[PDB]
């Protein structure tokens, strides 16, 4: 049939050369073909056919018509009805992630798939699809939908099976958990994933995912920077080959560990050539500008980098969370130095020293009183910040308070037995 | 001892999770971990056989 | 799962948008065969119309009963009645433990549907009594509890939740624990202790995966309204806003999410109009509260607290605009609130300072010590008096 | 006696929307 010749090949070319209009008539021949008719010989033609379809899809130039074509991948997979169908899937998943065929159509196609997978084919094929579904939902920021699906799979089997592909679902689940800011459920999941990983048995794409997740948990959450970074270096090198969007993230993350550690030396070295230049985008400069801002002790420099760079910063949920934690800490460190005399320091003198703007400082201080992240009070009626000085003993009141509460419990017991007298 | 070990091991994973109770996901993982380790220690005709 | 029914009841309680929910409420007894029972659930709704039925009026907004609702009820009791008798007969044949308790539950359902509330409660006790595993005993308490929660009669709810919680470690009925967590939070909202509800709900989401009980997502949304009402910002900040629960769901949260965002931004005009929004969408959507007056006092006092906590001085205009509530109103509430000392403030209206005595100072620690301390003297005197003669 | 706050509920929600414009 078609696998990289005739109808499918003609379509590939048609997207690239002409227009989308041209591709439509062609695609109808390919959908029809996939349904029960397939290349059943595992002597080249077959792996090429699913693959060639994966290249048309994730070509991309995406539009609704192409989404419809994506829905067909599943009958093409069903028709094969062999062991070889599973290997084909694993290979296929990366093309989709780098470049979507369309976000809305793909999530739905995957949810359908899982049912089919559990039944007819092997758990090797089942594990692989779930990793696509979970990654897909995560970018959509339906953080719950992704976790719910992944967890459904784990729950059905773990009785004696682990596999490299099964770990990958769990790596992607950890990533979703890191973005919410929850380490426990992620840490439990990390363990199972690293254990099968120790002995390599995987293509470069799985290795990089295992390295990147181990790194996010170790960097921000557990707080060992040496441990986080080391995994990131491997993750980049693995990511760069098969992937595009993934590789971008991993390089920024490399810079991120070292920014928190607050050494400039490492950040600068990492920015520079390992394979870094190609994936290095506008965000290398966001990460670089924030490092200088922490170092220098300027809060103002930081706010600015966030605003300008924001779309890219926001898109990967993990990055945003990390950047946010970095922001709350910077803000607290810088304040302590200016405030320190106590008394009635004017909001304006501190503002100048701190390296902040007038509008920004007022707001930051306002949040802080409530949080009690400096233990002062802000006076908006006079336009001064007062910091609470040490007062005379609270101790006297507290000991009285404690004694009187214990006696009140006792009184309640004391009365009941007394009832007997009268 | 192996069955005692599966129940106990399950409870340990659930704490990590931030739970106070086991789930299915932990219970099944425990079974695997105790039995494979036993089969690894006990066998030694398996080197590239069965 | 029947938690939807409680959401139907609640919205009419405050008289605002009642109309649509009234109809939806009416449909649930047809299914069940609950005609009589409905009048009892109606009581909980109080401070609005709920009186019209096929056996009553048709004038007010609350929906008429169908001819069909009545007929279905006749069917259901006949069928229940038939099951009970049938279940016993099967019990003689085989094992005593499981089969007999199932029979007593049939009897309780039958009495509970016709409307013999007292009768249902004596039967329900029977169920509890009969020798089966502790795990199975729990399953039977959860149905009555939900029914109890509906009427919002305090006594029924206390009993079930309290025994249910004991059993968990002793039996080892950890699997049941999941339904139970949610059930503990329902109890907790149901008394006028929104304080308990705020700590309870937040825990409930993390330990819950699934085991025969309402969705994960629904709880998170509900967690936010309890969390805010009871908790002040440093507690709130750690728990929900940094915590997992709220972020994962994302969508369906805007009323509540607007509250948290505004509170972070710390522009009080924005926080106050979102207080009102979360009150209308979320807070009124609960029937819960044995005196509604407590719910209203706590939402106003919390929002007020945040504004006053941040600043030792404010000008009157900033404070007054931020609340958005009247001079008459602000004053009227303020007199009640100050006594408590959660606010601990005073208004210099003629120079235009809103001063705060500080609820973190010596003046505060004193207010509590004295208040407790004086009442203790009166008490030593009452105890002392009994003892001498 | 009975809390004036209840009566205040209906009145307070509505006030908020108008008030912010009316007065600074």
PDB file of N, CA and C in Angstrom, chain A residues 141-144 147-148 155 177 180-182 185 328 363 366-367 369-373 377-381 386 388 391-394 397-398 400-401 404-405 407-408 411-412 414-415 418 421-422, chain C residues 206 209-210 216-217 233-234 237 242-244 247-251 263-266 268 306 309-315 318 358 360-362 365-366 368-369 372-373 376 379 382-383 385-387 389:
ATOM      1  N   UNK A 141      -3.377  23.174  31.131  1.00  0.00           N
ATOM      2  CA  UNK A 141      -3.469  23.561  32.485  1.00  0.00           C
ATOM      3  C   UNK A 141      -4.772  23.011  33.059  1.00  0.00           C
ATOM      4  N   UNK A 142      -5.160  21.808  32.663  1.00  0.00           N
ATOM      5  CA  UNK A 142      -6.156  21.114  33.361  1.00  0.00           C
ATOM      6  C   UNK A 142      -5.399  20.016  34.065  1.00  0.00           C
ATOM      7  N   UNK A 143      -4.808  20.457  35.169  1.00  0.00           N
ATOM      8  CA  UNK A 143      -3.764  19.832  35.951  1.00  0.00           C
ATOM      9  C   UNK A 143      -4.410  18.648  36.588  1.00  0.00           C
ATOM     10  N   UNK A 144      -5.713  18.814  36.981  1.00  0.00           N
ATOM     11  CA  UNK A 144      -6.497  17.738  37.509  1.00  0.00           C
ATOM     12  C   UNK A 144      -6.832  16.611  36.573  1.00  0.00           C
ATOM     13  N   UNK A 147      -3.806  14.364  36.100  1.00  0.00           N
ATOM     14  CA  UNK A 147      -3.458  13.520  37.248  1.00  0.00           C
ATOM     15  C   UNK A 147      -4.427  12.410  37.414  1.00  0.00           C
ATOM     16  N   UNK A 148      -5.699  12.631  37.196  1.00  0.00           N
ATOM     17  CA  UNK A 148      -6.824  11.692  37.383  1.00  0.00           C
ATOM     18  C   UNK A 148      -6.645  10.498  36.480  1.00  0.00           C
ATOM     19  N   UNK A 155      -3.465   2.408  39.374  1.00  0.00           N
ATOM     20  CA  UNK A 155      -4.339   1.741  40.234  1.00  0.00           C
ATOM     21  C   UNK A 155      -4.747   0.379  39.756  1.00  0.00           C
ATOM     22  N   UNK A 177       2.451  17.807  39.647  1.00  0.00           N
ATOM     23  CA  UNK A 177       2.502  17.959  41.139  1.00  0.00           C
ATOM     24  C   UNK A 177       3.481  19.040  41.555  1.00  0.00           C
ATOM     25  N   UNK A 180       1.789  22.475  41.033  1.00  0.00           N
ATOM     26  CA  UNK A 180       0.882  22.879  42.100  1.00  0.00           C
ATOM     27  C   UNK A 180       1.514  23.338  43.370  1.00  0.00           C
ATOM     28  N   UNK A 181       2.827  22.862  43.569  1.00  0.00           N
ATOM     29  CA  UNK A 181       3.616  23.027  44.767  1.00  0.00           C
ATOM     30  C   UNK A 181       3.385  22.033  45.829  1.00  0.00           C
ATOM     31  N   UNK A 182       3.457  20.772  45.404  1.00  0.00           N
ATOM     32  CA  UNK A 182       3.318  19.635  46.242  1.00  0.00           C
ATOM     33  C   UNK A 182       4.270  18.557  45.828  1.00  0.00           C
ATOM     34  N   UNK A 185       3.424  13.590  46.963  1.00  0.00           N
ATOM     35  CA  UNK A 185       2.875  12.609  46.084  1.00  0.00           C
ATOM     36  C   UNK A 185       3.876  12.327  44.904  1.00  0.00           C
ATOM     37  N   UNK A 328       9.109  35.757  46.090  1.00  0.00           N
ATOM     38  CA  UNK A 328       8.713  36.009  47.493  1.00  0.00           C
ATOM     39  C   UNK A 328       9.982  36.067  48.420  1.00  0.00           C
ATOM     40  N   UNK A 363       2.804  48.749  48.214  1.00  0.00           N
ATOM     41  CA  UNK A 363       2.024  47.513  48.027  1.00  0.00           C
ATOM     42  C   UNK A 363       2.736  46.316  48.718  1.00  0.00           C
ATOM     43  N   UNK A 366       2.363  46.406  52.368  1.00  0.00           N
ATOM     44  CA  UNK A 366       1.014  46.186  52.756  1.00  0.00           C
ATOM     45  C   UNK A 366       0.640  44.670  52.887  1.00  0.00           C
ATOM     46  N   UNK A 367       1.202  43.892  51.964  1.00  0.00           N
ATOM     47  CA  UNK A 367       1.004  42.521  51.943  1.00  0.00           C
ATOM     48  C   UNK A 367       1.742  42.008  53.146  1.00  0.00           C
ATOM     49  N   UNK A 369       2.551  43.122  56.229  1.00  0.00           N
ATOM     50  CA  UNK A 369       2.054  43.313  57.567  1.00  0.00           C
ATOM     51  C   UNK A 369       1.145  42.202  57.981  1.00  0.00           C
ATOM     52  N   UNK A 370       0.303  41.783  57.077  1.00  0.00           N
ATOM     53  CA  UNK A 370      -0.670  40.740  57.263  1.00  0.00           C
ATOM     54  C   UNK A 370      -0.038  39.382  57.400  1.00  0.00           C
ATOM     55  N   UNK A 371       0.924  39.183  56.545  1.00  0.00           N
ATOM     56  CA  UNK A 371       1.693  37.943  56.475  1.00  0.00           C
ATOM     57  C   UNK A 371       2.604  37.901  57.755  1.00  0.00           C
ATOM     58  N   UNK A 372       2.939  39.093  58.370  1.00  0.00           N
ATOM     59  CA  UNK A 372       3.855  39.358  59.427  1.00  0.00           C
ATOM     60  C   UNK A 372       5.191  38.869  59.051  1.00  0.00           C
ATOM     61  N   UNK A 373       5.692  39.231  57.870  1.00  0.00           N
ATOM     62  CA  UNK A 373       6.955  38.924  57.277  1.00  0.00           C
ATOM     63  C   UNK A 373       7.994  40.062  57.545  1.00  0.00           C
ATOM     64  N   UNK A 377       3.888  47.694  61.340  1.00  0.00           N
ATOM     65  CA  UNK A 377       2.561  48.107  61.004  1.00  0.00           C
ATOM     66  C   UNK A 377       2.761  49.176  60.053  1.00  0.00           C
ATOM     67  N   UNK A 378       1.876  49.358  59.014  1.00  0.00           N
ATOM     68  CA  UNK A 378       2.027  50.334  58.002  1.00  0.00           C
ATOM     69  C   UNK A 378       1.003  51.422  58.290  1.00  0.00           C
ATOM     70  N   UNK A 379       1.420  52.701  58.272  1.00  0.00           N
ATOM     71  CA  UNK A 379       0.496  53.778  58.589  1.00  0.00           C
ATOM     72  C   UNK A 379       0.210  54.537  57.335  1.00  0.00           C
ATOM     73  N   UNK A 380      -0.984  54.365  56.785  1.00  0.00           N
ATOM     74  CA  UNK A 380      -1.336  55.002  55.522  1.00  0.00           C
ATOM     75  C   UNK A 380      -1.881  56.437  55.755  1.00  0.00           C
ATOM     76  N   UNK A 381      -2.318  56.733  57.031  1.00  0.00           N
ATOM     77  CA  UNK A 381      -2.787  58.051  57.410  1.00  0.00           C
ATOM     78  C   UNK A 381      -1.729  59.067  57.502  1.00  0.00           C
ATOM     79  N   UNK A 386       6.056  52.065  60.436  1.00  0.00           N
ATOM     80  CA  UNK A 386       6.577  52.004  61.825  1.00  0.00           C
ATOM     81  C   UNK A 386       6.827  50.605  61.995  1.00  0.00           C
ATOM     82  N   UNK A 388       7.480  47.494  64.774  1.00  0.00           N
ATOM     83  CA  UNK A 388       7.194  47.268  66.149  1.00  0.00           C
ATOM     84  C   UNK A 388       8.432  47.030  66.889  1.00  0.00           C
ATOM     85  N   UNK A 391       8.263  45.237  73.161  1.00  0.00           N
ATOM     86  CA  UNK A 391       7.494  45.898  74.248  1.00  0.00           C
ATOM     87  C   UNK A 391       7.841  45.258  75.531  1.00  0.00           C
ATOM     88  N   UNK A 392       7.392  45.754  76.678  1.00  0.00           N
ATOM     89  CA  UNK A 392       7.514  45.070  77.985  1.00  0.00           C
ATOM     90  C   UNK A 392       6.737  43.790  77.947  1.00  0.00           C
ATOM     91  N   UNK A 393       7.189  42.864  78.786  1.00  0.00           N
ATOM     92  CA  UNK A 393       6.701  41.564  78.973  1.00  0.00           C
ATOM     93  C   UNK A 393       5.210  41.333  78.600  1.00  0.00           C
ATOM     94  N   UNK A 394       4.984  40.372  77.755  1.00  0.00           N
ATOM     95  CA  UNK A 394       3.667  39.789  77.580  1.00  0.00           C
ATOM     96  C   UNK A 394       3.504  38.703  78.562  1.00  0.00           C
ATOM     97  N   UNK A 397       0.764  38.267  81.574  1.00  0.00           N
ATOM     98  CA  UNK A 397      -0.641  38.083  81.107  1.00  0.00           C
ATOM     99  C   UNK A 397      -0.833  36.604  80.711  1.00  0.00           C
ATOM    100  N   UNK A 398       0.183  36.064  80.014  1.00  0.00           N
ATOM    101  CA  UNK A 398       0.110  34.735  79.422  1.00  0.00           C
ATOM    102  C   UNK A 398       0.037  33.682  80.473  1.00  0.00           C
ATOM    103  N   UNK A 400      -1.130  34.160  83.508  1.00  0.00           N
ATOM    104  CA  UNK A 400      -2.426  34.237  84.121  1.00  0.00           C
ATOM    105  C   UNK A 400      -3.501  33.619  83.368  1.00  0.00           C
ATOM    106  N   UNK A 401      -3.416  33.766  82.054  1.00  0.00           N
ATOM    107  CA  UNK A 401      -4.344  33.277  81.048  1.00  0.00           C
ATOM    108  C   UNK A 401      -4.398  31.756  81.059  1.00  0.00           C
ATOM    109  N   UNK A 404      -5.942  30.335  84.403  1.00  0.00           N
ATOM    110  CA  UNK A 404      -7.390  30.512  84.533  1.00  0.00           C
ATOM    111  C   UNK A 404      -8.108  29.514  83.643  1.00  0.00           C
ATOM    112  N   UNK A 405      -7.606  29.188  82.374  1.00  0.00           N
ATOM    113  CA  UNK A 405      -8.238  28.230  81.474  1.00  0.00           C
ATOM    114  C   UNK A 405      -8.277  26.821  82.059  1.00  0.00           C
ATOM    115  N   UNK A 407      -8.281  25.946  85.327  1.00  0.00           N
ATOM    116  CA  UNK A 407      -9.157  25.987  86.450  1.00  0.00           C
ATOM    117  C   UNK A 407     -10.568  25.856  85.957  1.00  0.00           C
ATOM    118  N   UNK A 408     -11.016  26.437  84.797  1.00  0.00           N
ATOM    119  CA  UNK A 408     -12.345  26.409  84.177  1.00  0.00           C
ATOM    120  C   UNK A 408     -12.749  24.989  83.783  1.00  0.00           C
ATOM    121  N   UNK A 411     -13.507  23.144  87.312  1.00  0.00           N
ATOM    122  CA  UNK A 411     -14.702  23.627  87.858  1.00  0.00           C
ATOM    123  C   UNK A 411     -15.866  22.861  87.356  1.00  0.00           C
ATOM    124  N   UNK A 412     -15.907  22.546  86.022  1.00  0.00           N
ATOM    125  CA  UNK A 412     -16.919  21.734  85.403  1.00  0.00           C
ATOM    126  C   UNK A 412     -17.021  20.308  85.958  1.00  0.00           C
ATOM    127  N   UNK A 414     -15.803  19.478  89.145  1.00  0.00           N
ATOM    128  CA  UNK A 414     -15.885  19.771  90.556  1.00  0.00           C
ATOM    129  C   UNK A 414     -17.331  19.867  90.912  1.00  0.00           C
ATOM    130  N   UNK A 415     -18.162  20.531  90.055  1.00  0.00           N
ATOM    131  CA  UNK A 415     -19.562  20.692  90.316  1.00  0.00           C
ATOM    132  C   UNK A 415     -20.316  19.398  90.304  1.00  0.00           C
ATOM    133  N   UNK A 418     -20.365  17.245  93.506  1.00  0.00           N
ATOM    134  CA  UNK A 418     -20.897  18.105  94.511  1.00  0.00           C
ATOM    135  C   UNK A 418     -22.427  18.033  94.657  1.00  0.00           C
ATOM    136  N   UNK A 421     -24.411  16.340  97.668  1.00  0.00           N
ATOM    137  CA  UNK A 421     -24.586  17.057  98.890  1.00  0.00           C
ATOM    138  C   UNK A 421     -25.903  17.717  98.849  1.00  0.00           C
ATOM    139  N   UNK A 422     -26.287  18.367  97.774  1.00  0.00           N
ATOM    140  CA  UNK A 422     -27.458  19.130  97.593  1.00  0.00           C
ATOM    141  C   UNK A 422     -27.636  19.329  96.059  1.00  0.00           C
TER     142      UNK A 422
ATOM    143  N   UNK C 206      -6.703  16.097  50.176  1.00  0.00           N
ATOM    144  CA  UNK C 206      -5.455  15.352  50.000  1.00  0.00           C
ATOM    145  C   UNK C 206      -5.606  13.930  50.245  1.00  0.00           C
ATOM    146  N   UNK C 209      -9.224  10.008  47.395  1.00  0.00           N
ATOM    147  CA  UNK C 209      -8.994   9.684  46.037  1.00  0.00           C
ATOM    148  C   UNK C 209     -10.394   9.379  45.536  1.00  0.00           C
ATOM    149  N   UNK C 210     -10.853   8.178  45.924  1.00  0.00           N
ATOM    150  CA  UNK C 210     -12.183   7.756  45.536  1.00  0.00           C
ATOM    151  C   UNK C 210     -12.501   6.519  46.463  1.00  0.00           C
ATOM    152  N   UNK C 216     -13.919  14.732  43.535  1.00  0.00           N
ATOM    153  CA  UNK C 216     -12.776  15.402  44.092  1.00  0.00           C
ATOM    154  C   UNK C 216     -12.887  16.835  43.915  1.00  0.00           C
ATOM    155  N   UNK C 217     -13.326  17.289  42.771  1.00  0.00           N
ATOM    156  CA  UNK C 217     -13.277  18.731  42.308  1.00  0.00           C
ATOM    157  C   UNK C 217     -14.171  19.644  43.088  1.00  0.00           C
ATOM    158  N   UNK C 233      -5.352  35.664  57.005  1.00  0.00           N
ATOM    159  CA  UNK C 233      -4.451  35.483  55.902  1.00  0.00           C
ATOM    160  C   UNK C 233      -3.187  34.678  56.195  1.00  0.00           C
ATOM    161  N   UNK C 234      -2.368  34.672  57.243  1.00  0.00           N
ATOM    162  CA  UNK C 234      -1.168  33.864  57.221  1.00  0.00           C
ATOM    163  C   UNK C 234      -1.494  32.377  57.147  1.00  0.00           C
ATOM    164  N   UNK C 237      -2.835  31.659  53.634  1.00  0.00           N
ATOM    165  CA  UNK C 237      -1.837  31.864  52.651  1.00  0.00           C
ATOM    166  C   UNK C 237      -1.098  30.526  52.302  1.00  0.00           C
ATOM    167  N   UNK C 242      -0.722  28.507  48.560  1.00  0.00           N
ATOM    168  CA  UNK C 242       0.444  27.810  48.154  1.00  0.00           C
ATOM    169  C   UNK C 242       0.064  26.358  47.888  1.00  0.00           C
ATOM    170  N   UNK C 243      -0.929  25.742  48.649  1.00  0.00           N
ATOM    171  CA  UNK C 243      -1.269  24.317  48.615  1.00  0.00           C
ATOM    172  C   UNK C 243      -1.814  23.927  47.270  1.00  0.00           C
ATOM    173  N   UNK C 244      -1.853  22.552  47.098  1.00  0.00           N
ATOM    174  CA  UNK C 244      -2.143  21.915  45.845  1.00  0.00           C
ATOM    175  C   UNK C 244      -3.515  22.020  45.343  1.00  0.00           C
ATOM    176  N   UNK C 247      -5.181  24.886  42.919  1.00  0.00           N
ATOM    177  CA  UNK C 247      -4.601  25.076  41.627  1.00  0.00           C
ATOM    178  C   UNK C 247      -4.955  24.008  40.538  1.00  0.00           C
ATOM    179  N   UNK C 248      -5.032  22.725  41.033  1.00  0.00           N
ATOM    180  CA  UNK C 248      -5.189  21.523  40.144  1.00  0.00           C
ATOM    181  C   UNK C 248      -6.529  21.592  39.475  1.00  0.00           C
ATOM    182  N   UNK C 249      -7.580  21.971  40.221  1.00  0.00           N
ATOM    183  CA  UNK C 249      -8.889  22.091  39.624  1.00  0.00           C
ATOM    184  C   UNK C 249      -9.035  23.180  38.575  1.00  0.00           C
ATOM    185  N   UNK C 250      -8.454  24.358  38.914  1.00  0.00           N
ATOM    186  CA  UNK C 250      -8.315  25.572  38.073  1.00  0.00           C
ATOM    187  C   UNK C 250      -9.696  26.210  37.839  1.00  0.00           C
ATOM    188  N   UNK C 251     -10.356  25.665  36.816  1.00  0.00           N
ATOM    189  CA  UNK C 251     -11.643  26.105  36.443  1.00  0.00           C
ATOM    190  C   UNK C 251     -12.729  25.726  37.402  1.00  0.00           C
ATOM    191  N   UNK C 263      -7.105  39.704  47.606  1.00  0.00           N
ATOM    192  CA  UNK C 263      -6.572  39.696  48.938  1.00  0.00           C
ATOM    193  C   UNK C 263      -5.012  39.763  48.820  1.00  0.00           C
ATOM    194  N   UNK C 264      -4.418  39.081  47.861  1.00  0.00           N
ATOM    195  CA  UNK C 264      -2.999  39.143  47.582  1.00  0.00           C
ATOM    196  C   UNK C 264      -2.516  40.547  47.077  1.00  0.00           C
ATOM    197  N   UNK C 265      -3.305  41.145  46.180  1.00  0.00           N
ATOM    198  CA  UNK C 265      -3.114  42.397  45.475  1.00  0.00           C
ATOM    199  C   UNK C 265      -3.238  43.494  46.459  1.00  0.00           C
ATOM    200  N   UNK C 266      -4.025  43.208  47.507  1.00  0.00           N
ATOM    201  CA  UNK C 266      -4.381  44.062  48.650  1.00  0.00           C
ATOM    202  C   UNK C 266      -4.972  45.431  48.328  1.00  0.00           C
ATOM    203  N   UNK C 268      -8.621  46.573  48.589  1.00  0.00           N
ATOM    204  CA  UNK C 268      -9.732  46.281  49.395  1.00  0.00           C
ATOM    205  C   UNK C 268     -11.057  46.535  48.731  1.00  0.00           C
ATOM    206  N   UNK C 306      -8.909  42.007  57.943  1.00  0.00           N
ATOM    207  CA  UNK C 306      -7.771  42.048  56.996  1.00  0.00           C
ATOM    208  C   UNK C 306      -7.392  43.483  56.702  1.00  0.00           C
ATOM    209  N   UNK C 309      -5.958  45.029  60.042  1.00  0.00           N
ATOM    210  CA  UNK C 309      -4.695  44.341  60.400  1.00  0.00           C
ATOM    211  C   UNK C 309      -3.467  44.969  59.666  1.00  0.00           C
ATOM    212  N   UNK C 310      -3.664  45.372  58.391  1.00  0.00           N
ATOM    213  CA  UNK C 310      -2.599  45.824  57.498  1.00  0.00           C
ATOM    214  C   UNK C 310      -2.143  47.217  57.856  1.00  0.00           C
ATOM    215  N   UNK C 311      -3.086  48.058  58.473  1.00  0.00           N
ATOM    216  CA  UNK C 311      -2.858  49.400  58.679  1.00  0.00           C
ATOM    217  C   UNK C 311      -3.195  49.869  60.068  1.00  0.00           C
ATOM    218  N   UNK C 312      -2.272  50.647  60.758  1.00  0.00           N
ATOM    219  CA  UNK C 312      -2.611  51.264  62.070  1.00  0.00           C
ATOM    220  C   UNK C 312      -3.446  52.498  61.803  1.00  0.00           C
ATOM    221  N   UNK C 313      -3.299  53.160  60.638  1.00  0.00           N
ATOM    222  CA  UNK C 313      -4.097  54.268  60.291  1.00  0.00           C
ATOM    223  C   UNK C 313      -4.493  54.195  58.938  1.00  0.00           C
ATOM    224  N   UNK C 314      -5.753  54.634  58.758  1.00  0.00           N
ATOM    225  CA  UNK C 314      -6.270  54.732  57.439  1.00  0.00           C
ATOM    226  C   UNK C 314      -7.011  55.995  57.556  1.00  0.00           C
ATOM    227  N   UNK C 315      -7.316  56.602  56.384  1.00  0.00           N
ATOM    228  CA  UNK C 315      -8.221  57.744  56.405  1.00  0.00           C
ATOM    229  C   UNK C 315      -9.545  57.061  56.337  1.00  0.00           C
ATOM    230  N   UNK C 318     -10.880  55.957  52.662  1.00  0.00           N
ATOM    231  CA  UNK C 318     -10.311  54.762  52.089  1.00  0.00           C
ATOM    232  C   UNK C 318     -11.027  53.535  52.715  1.00  0.00           C
ATOM    233  N   UNK C 358      -4.627  47.506  68.158  1.00  0.00           N
ATOM    234  CA  UNK C 358      -3.807  46.464  67.790  1.00  0.00           C
ATOM    235  C   UNK C 358      -4.266  45.130  68.354  1.00  0.00           C
ATOM    236  N   UNK C 360      -2.511  42.642  68.569  1.00  0.00           N
ATOM    237  CA  UNK C 360      -1.331  41.876  68.819  1.00  0.00           C
ATOM    238  C   UNK C 360      -0.680  42.439  70.039  1.00  0.00           C
ATOM    239  N   UNK C 361      -1.211  43.468  70.730  1.00  0.00           N
ATOM    240  CA  UNK C 361      -0.640  44.213  71.790  1.00  0.00           C
ATOM    241  C   UNK C 361      -1.014  43.654  73.169  1.00  0.00           C
ATOM    242  N   UNK C 362      -0.464  44.334  74.245  1.00  0.00           N
ATOM    243  CA  UNK C 362      -0.741  44.131  75.655  1.00  0.00           C
ATOM    244  C   UNK C 362      -2.239  44.408  75.986  1.00  0.00           C
ATOM    245  N   UNK C 365      -4.352  41.100  75.267  1.00  0.00           N
ATOM    246  CA  UNK C 365      -3.987  39.951  76.069  1.00  0.00           C
ATOM    247  C   UNK C 365      -4.631  40.165  77.406  1.00  0.00           C
ATOM    248  N   UNK C 366      -4.661  41.493  77.811  1.00  0.00           N
ATOM    249  CA  UNK C 366      -5.413  41.956  78.968  1.00  0.00           C
ATOM    250  C   UNK C 366      -6.899  41.747  78.778  1.00  0.00           C
ATOM    251  N   UNK C 368      -8.647  39.670  77.093  1.00  0.00           N
ATOM    252  CA  UNK C 368      -9.017  38.317  77.293  1.00  0.00           C
ATOM    253  C   UNK C 368      -8.920  37.783  78.762  1.00  0.00           C
ATOM    254  N   UNK C 369      -7.778  38.142  79.439  1.00  0.00           N
ATOM    255  CA  UNK C 369      -7.487  37.689  80.798  1.00  0.00           C
ATOM    256  C   UNK C 369      -8.511  38.150  81.822  1.00  0.00           C
ATOM    257  N   UNK C 372     -12.129  36.439  81.009  1.00  0.00           N
ATOM    258  CA  UNK C 372     -12.181  35.080  81.510  1.00  0.00           C
ATOM    259  C   UNK C 372     -12.119  35.117  83.025  1.00  0.00           C
ATOM    260  N   UNK C 373     -11.251  35.935  83.557  1.00  0.00           N
ATOM    261  CA  UNK C 373     -10.817  35.944  84.989  1.00  0.00           C
ATOM    262  C   UNK C 373     -11.889  36.253  85.976  1.00  0.00           C
ATOM    263  N   UNK C 376     -14.499  33.457  86.303  1.00  0.00           N
ATOM    264  CA  UNK C 376     -14.032  32.450  87.128  1.00  0.00           C
ATOM    265  C   UNK C 376     -14.298  32.641  88.672  1.00  0.00           C
ATOM    266  N   UNK C 379     -17.874  31.690  89.495  1.00  0.00           N
ATOM    267  CA  UNK C 379     -17.858  30.248  89.505  1.00  0.00           C
ATOM    268  C   UNK C 379     -17.310  29.549  90.777  1.00  0.00           C
ATOM    269  N   UNK C 382     -19.987  29.764  93.231  1.00  0.00           N
ATOM    270  CA  UNK C 382     -21.067  28.788  93.123  1.00  0.00           C
ATOM    271  C   UNK C 382     -20.641  27.399  93.617  1.00  0.00           C
ATOM    272  N   UNK C 383     -19.399  26.988  93.318  1.00  0.00           N
ATOM    273  CA  UNK C 383     -18.918  25.697  93.831  1.00  0.00           C
ATOM    274  C   UNK C 383     -18.754  25.561  95.254  1.00  0.00           C
ATOM    275  N   UNK C 385     -20.292  27.393  97.452  1.00  0.00           N
ATOM    276  CA  UNK C 385     -21.569  27.419  98.182  1.00  0.00           C
ATOM    277  C   UNK C 385     -22.158  26.078  98.395  1.00  0.00           C
ATOM    278  N   UNK C 386     -22.080  25.163  97.398  1.00  0.00           N
ATOM    279  CA  UNK C 386     -22.634  23.848  97.545  1.00  0.00           C
ATOM    280  C   UNK C 386     -21.913  23.090  98.631  1.00  0.00           C
ATOM    281  N   UNK C 387     -20.520  23.112  98.664  1.00  0.00           N
ATOM    282  CA  UNK C 387     -19.678  22.308  99.447  1.00  0.00           C
ATOM    283  C   UNK C 387     -19.890  22.497 100.934  1.00  0.00           C
ATOM    284  N   UNK C 389     -22.502  23.261 102.840  1.00  0.00           N
ATOM    285  CA  UNK C 389     -23.705  22.590 103.330  1.00  0.00           C
ATOM    286  C   UNK C 389     -24.454  21.891 102.218  1.00  0.00           C
TER     287      UNK C 389
END
